[PDB]
A paper describes a structure:
We report TOSV endonuclease crystal structures in the apo form, in complex with a di-ketoacid inhibitor (DPBA) and in an intermediate state of inhibitor release, showing details on substrate binding and active site dynamics.
The structure of the TOSV EN with DPBA shows the inhibitor binding through chelation of two Mn2+ in the active site of each molecule in the asu. The Mn2+ ion occupancies in the structure are of 1 and 0.72 for positions Mn1 and Mn2 respectively. Upon DPBA binding the number of bound sulphate ions is also reduced relative to the apo structure, thus suggesting a lower affinity for sulphate ions. Only SO4− is present in molB and no density is observed for SO42+ and SO43+ sulphate ions in molA and molB.
Numbering used by the authors: 2 to 205
Amino acid sequence: ERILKKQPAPVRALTIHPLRRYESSIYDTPIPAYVIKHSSDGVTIDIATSELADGQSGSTIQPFESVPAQNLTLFKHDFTFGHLADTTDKKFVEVFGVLENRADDSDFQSPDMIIETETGHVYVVEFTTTMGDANSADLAARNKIAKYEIACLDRSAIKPISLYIIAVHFNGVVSNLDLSDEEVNEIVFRFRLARDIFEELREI
Ligand SMILES: O=C(O)C(=O)CC(=O)c1ccccc1
Ligand SMILES: [Mn+2]
Ligand SMILES: [Mn+2]
């Protein structure tokens, strides 16, 4: 029995912390070689993690990164943020039930994460990437906010919601999380490697 579930009710509202621009500081860091291995189910990326220095950026990458067939088209997105979410996409209805007397499209939207805490707070997290610059990253983040703001606001009448975004570009991150330099660098480092592996997968 969990006592933190027995607290008075929090304010039921939508909270959005402001977006901030972060710059990567990956200053000439080893990037691991890779070989794309044919598998029964999708591919497995054989990545030479032994080439990396202990604790350098990229230390969250696994020696063998499985990419099942069903996750292939979102590889760039999912490899980039794979150290933060095992998987992505959870439907609103799975956490809130149907909002109104009748279901509608907002019940079946699925941001990359919907996290419910014992204290009764819900965190909605959306990841996105861009091949553009920091200005393109800020625009992609604002587009994800606009995509989910209505569903979050309506469901905030049930449990309070905080909506977080991470948008990655080649040289940094736009996010309303409060990220360290090392956390920014991990996201960017994985995105940069993901871009490389993608140029190969698309040719194959
Ligand atoms: O674009 C993103 O940032 C997504 O997180 C997309 C996503 O979930 C998805 C799922 C199924 C089909 C197309 C996109
Ligand atoms: Mn998604
Ligand atoms: Mn996403």
